[PDB]
Design a protein around this ligand. Structure first.
Ligand SMILES: *C(=O)[C@@H]([C@@H]1NC(C(=O)O)=C(S[C@@H]2CN[C@H](C(=O)Nc3cccc(C(=O)O)c3)C2)[C@@H]1C)[C@@H](C)O
Length: 129
């Protein structure tokens, strides 16, 4: 269980992302989670911050630091993951995460994770599964 019924939610299996307001969604979007080599965990993560013109930095699973200046970012925790809008990725659908192999988190459409930033609040829960 997480909070009142509001949260970001994803389904990697089904490569689809959501926002949830009212236990129902605010967002419905198609995504791509992280690559098979370094899979996404799915379960319960947390947007304790929603972002605008964020930058997805860090280090690759290889030890190769990176950046991805994102329009909208939810730096979620304890899992490494992070849901975000992805203007750089033109695909979302059936399993891209394996073929396109994008890092470890969920690559959400630029149009939706904005909405998100607009509905989710610092403290909203994040899910992928
Ligand atoms: C979505 O993919 C999201 C982030 N991508 C990555 C990623 O690893 O590329 C993660 S996991 C996160 C990345 N930064 C940490 C990490 O792996 N550090 C690391 C890894 C290997 C070696 C070193 C080192 O030598 O210091 C460090 C964990 C995350 C889902 C957004 C932000 O792009």
């Amino acid at each position: 269980g997480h909070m009142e019924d509001t949260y970001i939610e994803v389904d990697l299996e089904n490569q689809h992302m959501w926002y949830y307001k009212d236990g129902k969604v605010a967002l419905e979007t198609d995504i791509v989670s992280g690559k098979p080599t370094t899979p996404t965990p799915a379960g319960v993560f947390y947007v304790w911050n929603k972002e605008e013109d964020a930058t997805l930095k860090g280090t690759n699973d290889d030890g190769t630091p990176y950046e991805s200046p994102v329009n909208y970012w939810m730096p979620i925790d304890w899992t490494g993951v992070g849901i975000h809008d992805s203007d750089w990725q033109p695909e979302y659908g059936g399993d891209l995460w394996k073929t396109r192999g994008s890092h470890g988190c969920i690559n959400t459409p630029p149009s939706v994770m904005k909405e998100l930033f607009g509905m989710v609040e610092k403290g909203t829960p994040v899910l992928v599964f």
